[PDB]
Amino acid sequence: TFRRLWPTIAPFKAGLIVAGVALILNAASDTFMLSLLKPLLDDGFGKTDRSVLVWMPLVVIGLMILRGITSYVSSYCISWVSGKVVMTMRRRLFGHMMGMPVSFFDKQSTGTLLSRITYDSEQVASSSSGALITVVREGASIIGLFIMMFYYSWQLSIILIVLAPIVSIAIRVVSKRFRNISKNMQNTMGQVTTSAEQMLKGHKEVLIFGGQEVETKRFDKVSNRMRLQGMKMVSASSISDPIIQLIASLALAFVLYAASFPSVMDSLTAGTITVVFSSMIALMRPLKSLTNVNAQFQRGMAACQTLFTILDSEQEKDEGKRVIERATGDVEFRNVTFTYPGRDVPALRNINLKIPAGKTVALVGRSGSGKSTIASLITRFYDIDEGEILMDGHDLREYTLASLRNQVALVSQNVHLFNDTVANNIAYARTEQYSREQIEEAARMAYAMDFINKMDNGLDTVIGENGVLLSGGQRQRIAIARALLRDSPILILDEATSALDTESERAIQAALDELQKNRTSLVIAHRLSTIEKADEIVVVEDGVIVERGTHNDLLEHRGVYAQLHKMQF
Amino acid sequence: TFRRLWPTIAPFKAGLIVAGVALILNAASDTFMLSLLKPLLDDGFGKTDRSVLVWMPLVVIGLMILRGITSYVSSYCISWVSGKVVMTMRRRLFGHMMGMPVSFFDKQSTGTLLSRITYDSEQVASSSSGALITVVREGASIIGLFIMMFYYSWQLSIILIVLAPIVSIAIRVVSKRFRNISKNMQNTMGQVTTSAEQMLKGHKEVLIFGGQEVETKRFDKVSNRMRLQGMKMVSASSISDPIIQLIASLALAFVLYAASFPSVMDSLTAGTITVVFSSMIALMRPLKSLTNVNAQFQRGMAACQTLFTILDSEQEKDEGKRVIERATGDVEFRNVTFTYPGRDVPALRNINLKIPAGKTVALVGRSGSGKSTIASLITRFYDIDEGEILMDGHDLREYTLASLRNQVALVSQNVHLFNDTVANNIAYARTEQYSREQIEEAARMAYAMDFINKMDNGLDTVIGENGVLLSGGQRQRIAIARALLRDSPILILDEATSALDTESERAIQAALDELQKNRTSLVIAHRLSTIEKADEIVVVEDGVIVERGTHNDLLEHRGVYAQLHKMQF
């Protein structure tokens, strides 16, 4: 196909014309070495004055140091252009996949999606520059061995391109008739292999009816039939070869015969026949690799469509209306329902919920009724299907996504810590505005100063993976510190795991309670300590909220909240 | 190696000592053609003597016809010994896999067991004659090319055996140093790829925290390292080939330089330097192919152990030699427990069942476990764990296995039919004693005569697979016919048909009712009609005989027989 990949290659056009000037000389330095068999065999060995054997070693090494220097220059000027186009393309893939809908990463997976910037992204330059040092290198040793063949003796070298195709079609139509004959009788052997299978199945009938010496005298007759049939498809294959060498041997019985009549011989000497025939066997390695130049350019440039689909997919919906400085209000769900893209059954049906100002709510769908699903919608990770969610008395879809997610922080047990310093992972993405003094204040407020003080360099230790490898308990307290520093009004505390690792858990529990003073909170509760203190507990009954009320109004009525209370016990 | 396969080949020492006489002659025809280079390049392709090109083309034809005739005789005389030592192993394999316990056939191998007759029995004579063609052909091809190289010139052919290991060890130790550097530099790419991986995972954290530019200004540094550490791996691999080519070209330079010194060291004639310098080129294929001889003789004699394990295994327990002619008695189960091999959970605990003379029993329990297992034990398809099964006043172990299994007939919907004319399929394994008139009478009594007459030749049409073929009802009726003809005085109906095809089910039911006059019946029950008309009914579930009684006496007590009607109704 024709592709729009060239504009990325076009700036790096200085390495694609030095790997073609210093790569033709790698093919014109091999065609110039086969030509040294003429002065060697003709007038270097036969006669006396052995000066063409002291002159020649300096020329076979001189054409092998020039074949090395011209092969390391054609592999550094094609790996500098095949390494700067698989770098300005991987950057584009990791500048568009960081802005797609969250629903895309699921249904794809992190591992498989990393195979489109590491494996099927160098295949666009490992099988498109590998089909350019094969049509320029092995397409220049064919125009080098054709003007070396004709230069020496056009009489013998023009007979070798009139018998070359005639021999090459008599080898194919002879090798083809023994390929449908060895395939015709191949299916005949399938009618006896199955005939053996139709007697191993009825083993229980072989025994019960007393027939054991009768079923064995039938495998003395159907095993003797796939031997003779197996001995016929090897006699049709061992006749396939001797008579494509005899057809090619008659080719080397007319060239020798042809070069004995006076006009078409002249004097072809001892050289000028080991250079015209040795050139004709070195000419057949380029010709069996110049055929696979569109079967390799369609295997590299066909992998430039599986990643140009990703590069041209739809990004997130950025329908923005207004900038929200601070969400000094309440978040209201009003008859909202949606399903995950990928599943068919509805996940959460029509729901009406409200998060008042300066208050907190709880969601206990612990059986697995999508209680975690009311955390993605407020952040617009997954877009709603029907209904409306209003923040500060206005729909979420109005605001810009940049200014909406700014007013939200997801504190949870699973937090991805970047491979950076702890002074950055505490103030990630806004290290410019916030000073180092405030970062210490945030950490001390979170009561996470103990772990950071234990670090070697304090507020500069590499904290992410391939670093100091903090444990799971310490990761959470950094998230509290991170959320506290930015002062995001909304709060969607996960608290999924109710650990009992005291001291560490006491600090986490004490630290979390400090965060929930202002800053309207949603808690997807698994720990019963913080369920009862909430202003208004709510429970997700499958797809819709059914039971709503404080801790005691919902317990006097049985419903399922009370049973959920007994499930905890 | 164990090589106890040799006794099966010892009778065939007539192809193996012709494929070594007509193969040394094939190897000594690729050596007598390279010796046609010295007369050509020396004594008639560079002189007025235009006669060596007149008798030579016909000598190439007369040596390539000889090569073909000596290569086809060495492929027909070793495909005849590779055929009669595999055909005589696929008669001991299918002469021992037809008398072993049924449990071996059930699930340990169902369709893969034919790979031991078709694939792993041909992979023993296809990689043990391919490691003898490649050690007598290409082990004489390096004696021919070692004597031709020494005869033409012993001074230049001894500076190619003393000067070749120097080159080989140098190439190997130069390649090892660039192979363990390209592997030390390979792990840095992994350590960078994982660093790139550890930012694709936290996409939700990349979005919610607002940092979309830090993550793309960090990939500009993580991917700018990938190209610099990737092109290093190319620069450290494109230096290997240019150096190990120069090391090999230096040997060529030194060999040519050696011939310069005429102080009794070299006197060649320009054809001796093409017969000696081309044999060395043609002496490396038969040295690369001779290394992979013990890598093929153990890939074709280790797969011969998979056959010798299946062979020489434990056949069925033939203990006991008591003789029984006709079981004119009753089968009396008494406190028998049995479990399938390959599992530990009891499939059938202690049962006590009775099969009196001239009586029938229905083993209902249609839930799908326990009832089916109370038919294999009578025929000793599976041995019993504990307890005793008593037939005609004595245990089954005492009687000979041949004399027991002939006393029972398994009539079932799923019946195997052999690939023979209907004449044997009705009288299988006893076509001698039983006459054709008796077969016709049995077919008439079974009311299968309508279909058999509908066949072209009557009682001579191939009735199994790859033949006339039949519907399930006709197969069942043929099973009834052969059961009637054999006149075995025990009967075990499966009767899992549940068919409702009128005019076929009518005949099947009539024939079955005619069959159950004599021949005490153990009728597995799915259709209620046979359950009604019977002597005694027994219910088994999980090996628990729970309800025993007649159709009416067992209904007033609910239990499960009252529920059995509720299953249908």
Ligand SMILES: CCCCCCCCCCCCCCCCCC(=O)OC[C@H](COP(=O)(O)OCCN)OC(=O)CCCCCCCCCCCCCCCCC
């Ligand atoms: C596209 C990108 C770029 C690709 C670039 C590719 C470059 C490939 C270059 C290939 C070059 C091959 C030839 C190199 C020759 C180098 C010099 C050499 O070695 O000369 C040998 C020979 C002289 O031999 P000398 O040392 O004197 O010993 C006594 C024998 N005369 O020199 C001789 O004089 C030769 C032997 C005598 C020949 C006499 C007969 C000449 C007939 C000429 C016919 C011309 C063609 C006519 C037909 C054309 C049909 C199309």
Ligand SMILES: CCCCCCCCCCCCCCCCCC(=O)OC[C@H](COP(=O)(O)OCCN)OC(=O)CCCCCCCCCCCCCCCCC
């Ligand atoms: C350290 C030891 C030193 C020993 C030194 C001995 C003295 C050396 C003296 C050298 C003198 C200079 C060279 C002169 C050689 C002249 C030979 C000659 O003219 O050729 C004779 C003959 C071929 O003659 P042709 O070319 O057909 O004749 C045509 C008409 N003129 O020539 C040939 O046919 C040669 C090629 C023979 C190839 C034989 C191949 C046999 C292969 C057998 C393989 C099987 C063996 C068994 C293996 C069993 C394995 C299990």
